[PDB]
Amino acid sequence: AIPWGGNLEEVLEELEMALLAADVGLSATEEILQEVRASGRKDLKEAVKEKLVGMLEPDATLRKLGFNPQKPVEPKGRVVLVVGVNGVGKTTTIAKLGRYYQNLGKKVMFCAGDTTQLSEWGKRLSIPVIQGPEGTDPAALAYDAVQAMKARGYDLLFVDTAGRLHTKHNLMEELKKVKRAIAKADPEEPKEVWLVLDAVTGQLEQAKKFHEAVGLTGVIVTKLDGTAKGGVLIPIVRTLKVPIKFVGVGEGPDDLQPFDPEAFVEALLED
């Protein structure tokens, strides 16, 4: 419980505790504390919320404007390239993404570009999966998938990718190839490139490599039902500078929640 209304120095000491306990981490926490003193506002809970919300929402034209007139997570286009290292919940996350968007009325397709599990999810969810024979070129596959999505009038295509980091072929170059192939099928695409990260392993070095290669537009952080306190989302967005799109909160297909930075911040600071 943080004493809003107590002495300036009392609020900050219990804020540091709350934030540190939440796994927001020393670097971000110190930043908030610095930011908060500076800003000589009487309403420090509202001031704290603004700084925490602020650092989760890194998305020029909006800077000039000062608000977003359109503000409900939805891909900006039809194709979402999903990237990440193996074992983070990439396949499962795609399955949950399909479920979530098909529950909203979208026609969703999957592309099995990790050349098993995805095909089976597609059957279960009644979602078509573009898939190929044992080791097919994932890039040629992604191109066929975008053409199939266009031709059959589908709204969303989720492209699964390899996540093995020290193989004979460079993972990042394979990704750029998939991304180039998608753009030959539809040059506006992929409008989303989404990194999947483990909460528990809330550790970002590799994550930056993903961004340099293919240009992230968002992150999905899985396993927020785990021992990692939810405050780890803060250093994730500070470091990556793309918003959290969804949070994974269990192993079943409905355990995916669109991220709400305002609800998150309110819950972070709750008594």
Binding residues for GTP: 84-91, 160-164, 222-225
**∠ Cα 164 110 181 (to 5°):** 70
Q: After which residues is the chain broken (C to N over 2.5 A)?
A: 59, 71, 115, 203
Q: Do residues 138 and 62 make contact, with C-beta atoms less than 8 angstroms apart?
A: no
Q: Which is nearer to ligand GDP, 90 or 99 (CB)?
A: 90
Residue ranges with strand state E in 100-178: 108-111, 129-130, 156-159
CB of 114 to ligand GDP, least distance (A): 7
Closest to 186 (Cα-Cα) out of 213, 138, 147, 215: 147
Q: Does 248 bind ligand GDP (CB under 6 A)?
A: yes
Report the residue number whose CB is nearest to ligand GDP.
248
Helix (H, G, I), strand (E, B), or coil: what is residue 175?
A: helix
Task: Give the one residue of 22, 36, 56, 88 binding ligand GDP; rule: CB under 6 A.
Answer: 88
CB of 262 to ligand GDP, least distance (A): 21
Inter-CA distances, 232 with 58, 110, 221, 266, Å: 16, 29, 9, 15
DSSP β-bridge partners for residue 79 = 157
Question: Which 220-239 positions form the footprint of ligand GDP (CB under 6 A)?
Answer: 222-223, 225
CB of 71 to ligand GDP, least distance (A): 26
Task: Give the one residue of 29, 92, 131, 217 binding ligand GDP; rule: CB under 6 A.
Answer: 92
Q: Which is nearer to ligand GDP, 192 or 255 (CB)?
A: 255
Q: How many residues bind ligand GDP (CB under 6 A)?
A: 18
Task: Give the one residue of 89, 128, 138, 218 binding ligand GDP; rule: CB under 6 A.
Answer: 89
Task: Give the one residue of 86, 119, 170, 203 binding ligand GDP; rule: CB under 6 A.
Answer: 86
CB of 169 to ligand GDP, least distance (A): 18
Q: Which is nearer to ligand GDP, 66 or 87 (CB)?
A: 87
Q: Does 122 bind ligand GDP (CB under 6 A)?
A: no
Q: Which is nearer to ligand GDP, 91 or 131 (CB)?
A: 91
- Sequence length of the chain is 271
Using the Cα atoms of residue 43, residue 241, residue 112 and residue 106 in order, give the sign of their dihedral. Answer: positive
Q: Do residues 149 and 157 make contact, with C-beta atoms less than 8 angstroms apart?
A: yes
Contacts to ligand GDP by CB under 6 A: 84, 86-92, 117, 163, 222-223, 225, 248-251, 255
